[PDB]
Design a protein around this ligand. Structure first.
Ligand SMILES: NC(=O)C1=CN([C@@H]2O[C@H](COP(=O)(O)OP(=O)(O)OC[C@H]3O[C@@H](n4cnc5c(N)ncnc54)[C@H](OP(=O)(O)O)[C@@H]3O)[C@@H](O)[C@H]2O)C=CC1
Ligand SMILES: NC(=O)C1=CN([C@@H]2O[C@H](COP(=O)(O)OP(=O)(O)OC[C@H]3O[C@@H](n4cnc5c(N)ncnc54)[C@H](OP(=O)(O)O)[C@@H]3O)[C@@H](O)[C@H]2O)C=CC1
Ligand SMILES: CC1(C)N=C(N)N=C(N)N1OCCCOc1cc(Cl)c(Cl)cc1Cl
Ligand SMILES: CC1(C)N=C(N)N=C(N)N1OCCCOc1cc(Cl)c(Cl)cc1Cl
Ligand SMILES: O=c1ccn([C@H]2C[C@H](O)[C@@H](COP(=O)(O)O)O2)c(=O)[nH]1
Ligand SMILES: O=c1ccn([C@H]2C[C@H](O)[C@@H](COP(=O)(O)O)O2)c(=O)[nH]1
Lengths: 327, 223, 328, 226
C-alpha cells in the first residue's frame, strides 16, 4: 500500500486558489446535474466541458458585436470519426444548410444568392447593402461576398472582380492540390488548405473564422486538424464541428481512405452573454449516443457530391434550444 | 438504521436496450427521452441478434471481481445476518426464458454462479451446474449462504420488472443500442426520482450501429 | 459522496483497452526506468517530454521526404506560462544567439541567407545551397536567396518577389506592423494574426514555412500567443521553436506595453526521427531543473529596434549537451 | 521489519539556492543536483526571504490528515511494545518540527513557536526551564525518538539548520526530503549536504514558479530501498 504519495499530491496543490478568484457569478445549483455525473466520457463532453470552463474561468471582455463575452484562449477537441459522427445531442441541429454551404465552398462560389435560393441563410446578414457598406465595400453588389472560402480554396491568389466572373485556371486550386497530395504523397507534412489570404482580407465580407485544415494519412486512414481563430461556442462551434467532420468524410472517400480523427483547434473561444442562460440549461442535459453519417459510396470526386448523397442516421437528441438575444 | 437488501447483497441489473420499431406516424420531429431506449427482446431472442461490443462489456462486468474488497463485503453481510467469521465469483440471476435463449456453448456462463428463476422447471430438469429458485425471496436466502462478490440480475423482461418493483436494484448498467429493431418485450420505464444517471461512457460502433453505456444509481431515497 | 465500488465502475469503462505486447515500436520496459519511476511530473518541460514519450510508445512508423523514417502522431498542444519562467529546455543544452538573430532577420523582412551566414548563424544554410534550390526547381535563384519566406511575408505579404536585394519598401501587407497596431488599439479583436503560409508563394520559397501562423490574445494588460506548427521535428526543431516564439511573445508584449502571459504551441504533424530515438531515451530519463528567466532591455519601445545585446537569459541550469544526429 | 525513520515518519524539508564561485571555471559550467545547496548566510536565509517558498513550508509542515493517523500510532506503539500514549494533547493532531538553536533564533518573534505545530529545539545549552509547556527542548538526537514515543503527532519534520540536517542524514533517520530549488545565486556560509544518489532518489517534481524575482521549483527525494 502506497498512501504516502497521497499527501505529496496535497502539498503540490498548495498554491492552488480559493473560492473568490474563480471569476464570474456562478450559482451552485446552476450545474447540479452536470456536476453530479461521476464519469463524463461521452465525446460530447469535450464541447460541454469547454463551455463550462469558459463560464467558470472565462475573461469578461467586450467585442466587435458590443454584446460582451466570456473568453479563453487555446483549446483542442478530438472526435473519432471511425466510431461516430459528432453531431451534438444536447440540443437539436439540422445539417441541410451547412452541407449546402460546404458544396458551395467546393464549387468555389462567392455568390450569396445561390444559398438564399436554397433557403440557406447562413450568409444572409453578411451580404446586405448595410453590411457591405460598413466594411467599406461600396462598389460590391448585394450578396457578392468577395474572395471568401470558396474562392481561396479554388483560386488563391487570383484577382477578385465580381461573383459572376469566370475564374477558371486563375489562382491556386488548393483543394485539387491537397487531394492529389493525399493520393500520391500521403506522408507529406504540407497537406494544408488555407483560407486566410492576408492580401484579400479587406475585400472579404468578413475574414474567415476557419483558418486552415491540415491532413494526416496513416495506414489507409485520414485525419484532419482545423484551426479556428474565433469560436462562438453557443452557436457556431456545434455547426463547425459537423461541417469539418463531413468534409473529412468527403475527402477520405474520394481518396479511398477511411476517415479517422477530426481534431478541432480553438483560438479565441468565447461564450456570448446573451447565450449564458441557454447554455446553463444545455449543460445539465445528458448526451445520447451519437448518430452516424452515410455518404453515397459511388461519389469518387470531391466535386460530384449533391445534397442527396448525405444521410445522418439514428440522430437522437434533446429539444431545440433557442440561443436568443432576448428569449 | 437497518439496511435494505439490494445494498447488503450488492444486487445490480445489467441490460441492453434498443429503440423501438413502433411506426411513429411522424419520424419527422419526434420526441426523445431515456425511455426512447427500451427494446429488450423479440420472439425469445435479442432484437439485434448480436452485438460483440455489448457482449464483451456484459462479460467483462459480470465476471469482474476484486478480491481485496470482498472481506469488507463478507463482514457487512455477516453483520446483517447476525453471523460472522474456489476462486471468488459473481452471481448472475436470470429468468427461465432468458436461460433458454443463451446458446448451449455459453451455458452455464463462465466464471459465474448461475441462478435461474422458474416455476415450471426444477433442478431435475437441468443437467448443468446451476441453482434453480422458484421465488425471488429464495434468491436472498441463497445469497446469504453463498460466497460471492456481486449479484447481477441479467434479464429477462419479467425478471427486470419485478426486481425493480421490489426495489432490489442498487444500480442499472444500461447499454444504449442506437438503432431500431422489432421488439415484443421492454425494460420498464425508469423513474427519474428513483434512479439517476451517474456515468456515461465513450461512444462506439459495433455491428453497424453506435452504442454507449450508462449507469443509473438508485437515487438516495428522499426526493 | 463517498462510495467504494464506484471504483469498479472505472474498471468497467475500460473493458475495451488494448493488451498486446509489441507496444507498436519495439521498446524495452526499462528504456524509460527513471522517467516512469517518478510519481508526479508537473514541471512544464514534461509537456515536451511526455509528447516524445507518447510518440515513441504509440507513434506511427512512416517514411519521409528524407528516407530517414520517423514515428509520428497528429495534433498536440503545449502551454507555457511566460509570467513564471522562460521555457528553455533544461534536459539538454540549448544556445540562443542563433535563434534570436533569425528573429531579428525576420523582423527586418529579410530573405538573404548571407546575412545570417556572416554572423555564423547556419540555421538556413542547407536550405540555400545550389543543390537544395535546384532540387526545389529554383534553377534561377541565387545561392542563399531563400525566396519569399517569413520575413518577406511578415512585412510584404502579397508583394511580387524578385530577388533578395530588391527594394520592397511599402509593397505588400506589413502584417507585423498591423498586429502591433491591433494589439495597441483594438485588443479585444479576434483577428490579430500573423500568417506566413502564403499559398500563392509556397513554390517560390526555399521551403514552405513550418510555423504557419501566430494568433494573439490580450486581457487585463496581458498578452498570450498561439503558434500553429504544421511539421515538428521533436528531437531537434521543437526545443528551439518553443524558445523563438516565447522570445517573440516577450518582444511584442514589451513594445505594446503589456506583460507576457502564455505561449501556446499547437503541433500538427509531430514526429521523432529514427536516428534521434537513442538520444531521446537518454534525455527522457533526465530530471528538469527550474527554468531560467529572460530579460529584455526595457528601453526598446519599437519592434524594429531590438539588437542582439538587448536579450539576456538568466540562471540557466541545464544537463549536458546531447547530439541528436547519430542514428540507431 | 521496522526502522526509525519509517516508523516515526521523519522527513526533511529545506530550501537551497545556488552558490557563487570566485573561480570562473576554465570551461562551460557543469550542473547536477548538488548545484542547489545554499542554506544560510550570517545566521539568516541567503536570499533574505521568499514568500512562495515560505507558504510552501507552512503548508507542508502544518498539514495533517486525521483519518489516517490511526494506522500510524498502531504502527508506532506496537514498535514501542506499549499500547498507546480528557485532552490527549490539546484536542487536535499536529506535526513535529525539529530545528536547531540558531535556526530557532532566525525566526521572528511574531512567528515563534510555529503555529499549529509541536515545536522542538536541539540545544545542548538551553534550559527547558525558560520555555513554555508546548515549546520542548532536547539534549541530543537520541532524545528526539523518545519525545516522539510519548506524543500524538502526524509526521515529524526536521527544518534545519545545516548541522541538524547533516547528522540526521548520516544517522539514516530521513525518509523523504522536500527540497525547494531556488534558482538564483547568493552569498552563503552554510550548505545542505551532498545527497548520495545511491541512498536517495527524486520521485516528484513540481511546476515552476516565480517569487521575489527568481524562479524556483519543489522536488521530493525518497529514501531508496538499498
Ligand atoms: N436486452 C437485454 O439486455 C436482455 C434481453 N433478454 C431478452 O428477453 C427475452 C426473455 O424475456 P421474458 O419473456 O421476460 O422472460 P424472462 O427470461 O424474464 O423469464 C420470466 C419467466 O422466467 C421465470 N420467472 C420470472 N420471475 C419469476 C419468479 N419470481 N418466480 C419463479 N419464476 C420466475 C418464469 O419461468 P417459468 O415459466 O418456468 O415459470 C417466467 O415465466 C428474450 O427475448 C431475451 O432474448 C434477456 C436478457 C437480457
Ligand atoms: N534553507 C533552509 O531551508 C534553512 C536554512 N537555515 C539557515 O542555516 C543557518 C543555521 O545553520 P547551522 O549553523 O547549521 O546551525 P543550526 O541552525 O542547525 O543549529 C544546530 C545547533 O543545534 C545544536 N546541535 C548540534 N549538533 C547537535 C546534536 N548532535 N544533538 C543536539 N543538538 C545539536 C547546537 O546547539 P547549542 O550549541 O546550543 O548546543 C548547534 O549550535 C541560518 O542561516 C538559517 O537561516 C535554517 C533552517 C532552514
Ligand atoms: C444483452 C446482454 C448480452 N447485454 C447486456 N448488457 N445485458 C444483458 N443482460 N445481456 O444478456 C444476458 C442474457 C442473454 O445472454 C446471452 C445471449 C446471447 Cl444471444 C449470447 Cl450469444 C450470449 C449471452 Cl451471454
Ligand atoms: C526556508 C524555509 C522557510 N523553507 C523551507 N522549505 N524549509 C525550511 N526549513 N524553512 O525554514 C525553517 C527555519 C526558518 O523559518 C523561518 C525563517 C524566517 Cl527568516 C522567517 Cl521570516 C520565517 C520562518 Cl518560519
Ligand atoms: O463558422 C463560424 C463563423 C463565425 N463564428 C463566430 C466567431 C465570432 O463570434 C464571430 C466572428 O467575428 P470575429 O471573430 O471575426 O470578430 O463569428 C463561429 O464560431 N463559426
Ligand atoms: O523551425 C523549424 C524548422 C523545421 N522543423 C522541421 C520539421 C520537419 O522535420 C522538417 C521540414 O520538413 P517538411 O515537413 O517541410 O517536409 O524540419 C522544425 O521542427 N522546426
Amino acid at each position: 500500500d502506497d498512501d504516502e504519495e497521497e499527501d505529496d499530491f496535497v502539498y503540490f496543490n498548495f498554491n492552488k486558489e480559493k473560492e473568490e478568484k474563480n471569476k464570474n457569478s456562478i450559482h451552485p445549483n446552476d450545474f447540479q446535474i452536470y456536476n453530479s455525473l461521476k464519469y463524463k466520457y461521452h465525446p460530447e463532453y469535450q464541447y460541454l466541458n469547454i463551455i463550462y470552463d469558459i463560464m467558470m474561468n472565462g475573461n469578461k471582455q467586450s467585442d466587435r458585436t458590443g454584446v460582451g463575452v466570456l473568453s479563453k484562449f487555446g483549446y483542442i477537441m478530438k472526435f473519432d470519426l471511425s466510431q461516430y459522427f459528432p453531431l451534438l445531442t444536447t440540443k437539436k441541429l439540422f445539417l441541410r444548410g451547412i452541407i449546402e454551404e460546404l458544396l458551395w465552398f467546393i464549387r468555389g462560389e462567392t455568390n450569396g444568392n445561390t444559398l438564399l435560393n436554397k433557403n440557406v441563410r447562413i450568409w444572409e446578414a453578411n451580404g446586405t447593402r448595410e453590411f457591405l457598406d460598413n466594411r467599406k465595400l461600396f462598389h460590391r453588389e448585394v450578396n457578392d461576398l468577395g474572395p471568401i472560402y470558396g474562392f481561396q480554396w479554388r483560386h488563391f491568389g487570383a484577382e477578385y472582380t465580381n461573383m459572376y466572373d469566370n475564374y477558371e485556371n486563375k489562382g491556386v486550386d488548393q483543394l485539387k492540390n491537397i487531394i492529389n497530395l493525399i493520393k500520391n504523397d500521403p506522408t507529406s507534412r504540407r497537406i494544408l488548405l488555407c483560407a486566410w489570404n492576408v492580401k484579400d482580407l479587406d475585400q472579404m465580407a468578413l475574414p474567415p473564422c476557419h483558418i486552415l485544415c491540415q491532413f494526416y494519412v496513416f495506414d489507409g486512414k485520414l485525419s484532419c486538424i482545423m484551426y479556428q481563430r474565433s469560436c462562438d461556442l453557443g452557436l457556431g462551434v456545434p455547426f463547425n464541428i459537423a461541417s469539418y467532420s463531413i468534409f473529412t468524410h468527403m475527402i477520405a472517400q474520394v481518396c479511398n481512405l477511411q476517415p479517422a480523427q477530426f481534431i478541432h483547434v480553438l483560438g479565441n473561444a468565447h461564450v456570448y452573454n446573451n447565450h449564458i442562460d441557454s447554455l446553463k440549461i444545455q449543460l445539465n442535459r445528458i448526451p445520447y449516443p451519437f448518430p452516424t453519417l452515410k455518404l453515397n459510396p459511388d461519389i469518387k470526386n470531391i466535386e460530384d457530391f449533391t445534397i442527396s448523397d448525405f444521410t445522418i442516421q439514428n440522430y437522437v437528441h434533446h429539444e431545440k434550444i433557442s440561443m436568443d438575444m432576448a428569449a | 438504521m437497518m439496511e435494505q437488501v439490494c445494498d447488503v447483497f450488492d444486487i445490480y441489473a445489467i441490460c441492453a436496450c434498443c429503440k423501438v420499431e413502433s411506426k411513429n406516424e411522424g419520424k419527422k420531429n419526434e420526441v426523445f427521452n431515456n425511455y426512447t431506449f427500451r427494446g429488450l427482446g423479440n420472439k425469445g431472442v435479442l432484437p439485434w441478434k448480436c452485438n460483440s461490443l455489448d457482449m464483451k462489456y456484459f462479460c467483462a462486468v459480470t465476471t469482474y471481481v476484486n478480491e481485496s474488497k470482498y472481506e469488507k463485503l463478507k463482514y457487512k453481510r455477516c453483520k446483517y445476518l447476525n453471523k460472522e467469521t474456489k476462486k471468488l465469483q459473481n452471481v448472475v440471476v436470470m429468468g427461465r426464458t432468458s436461460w433458454e435463449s443463451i446458446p448451449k456453448k455459453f451455458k452455464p456462463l463462465s466464471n459465474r454462479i448461475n441462478v435461474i428463476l422458474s416455476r415450471t422447471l426444477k433442478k431435475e430438469d437441468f443437467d448443468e451446474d446451476v441453482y434453480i429458485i422458484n421465488k425471488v425471496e429464495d434468491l436472498i436466502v441463497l445469497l446469504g449462504k453463498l460466497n460471492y462478490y456481486k449479484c447481477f440480475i441479467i434479464g429477462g423482461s419479467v425478471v427486470y420488472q419485478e426486481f425493480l418493483e421490489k426495489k432490489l436494484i442498487k444500480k442499472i448498467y444500461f447499454t444504449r443500442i442506437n438503432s431500431t429493431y422489432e421488439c415484443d418485450v421492454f425494460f420498464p420505464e425508469i423513474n427519474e426520482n428513483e434512479y439517476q444517471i451517474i456515468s456515461v461512457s465513450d461512444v462506439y460502433t459495433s455491428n453497424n450501429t453506435t452504442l454507449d453505456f450508462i449507469i443509473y444509481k438508485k437515487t438516495n431515497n428522499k426526493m
